[PDB]
Design a protein around this nucleic acid. Structure first.
Ligand code: CL
Ligand code: ZN
Ligand code: ZN
Lengths: 126, 125
DNA sequence: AGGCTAGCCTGCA
DNA sequence: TGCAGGCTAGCCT
């Protein structure tokens, strides 16, 4: 199972409750990418940590947030926190790489959630 | 508070969990009627049991059901059970009065939830 | 019949 | 003004 494999790459120490939510977050993404033929691309990006992977996109919602098991957040933040930066505070601490065509900031119809298409930045000064 | 007053007219015996759900049902209806200026009419129908009150309408959903908290049901059944018949089992046991212009069965854009616009009927079975 | 969530509304910083 | 969280109609199983 792809879900369990992807969960093995999860960052940080999680308690019982967070482990269950994290599993739901991965399941939710796996369902969306399976219908658009983007699942293999997610496995490649996560399991190899490769920046030279395609955009991994999901439809953008009106307010940009994604709800998973009663929790709401920005999906690129959710998946960057899960697989790269467990203490990631907000979207203000993420900047997309130059080659990311569907970065969150672009506000296109689709949003890229490939964590290796983002870089962590210090909280903006101004 | 109109919620506490309308809840005083609630029928049946309720435990702690049902009491909280019933309060949510009344709150949910009060919110909807406040925006359409029909709250005073609900107070009138519930406190006077007058069949000669206007239709108390809420927008009709695609499947007819209403969700209050995490429970789904037919809204005229919900509010008829709350204020008139606590052992009302289904919509099949209810029929709208002749003067009800927005009866559930009519399937109009708006649905009447005035309990005094409905009567109990023999179960079709 | 019942579960999940995007959109809607709302109060807070 | 953005940000956060409650509620539920529409959609799905
Ligand atoms: Cl792509
Ligand atoms: Zn990208
Ligand atoms: Zn009526």
């Amino acid at each position: 199972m792809i879900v369990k494999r992807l969960l093995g790459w999860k960052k940080g120490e999680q308690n019982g409750q967070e482990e269950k939510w994290c599993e739901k977050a991965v399941k939710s993404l796996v369902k969306k990418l399976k219908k658009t033929g983007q699942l293999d691309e997610l496995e490649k990006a996560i399991t190899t940590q490769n920046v030279n992977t395609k955009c991994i996109t999901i439809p953008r919602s009106l307010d940009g947030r994604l709800q998973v098991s009663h929790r709401k957040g920005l999906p690129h933040v959710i998946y960057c926190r899960l697989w790269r930066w467990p203490d990631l505070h907000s979207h203000h601490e993420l900047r997309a790489m130059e080659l990311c065509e569907f970065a969150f900031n672009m506000k296109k119809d689709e949003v890229c959630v490939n964590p290796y298409h983002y870089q962590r930045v210090e909280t903006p000064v101004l």
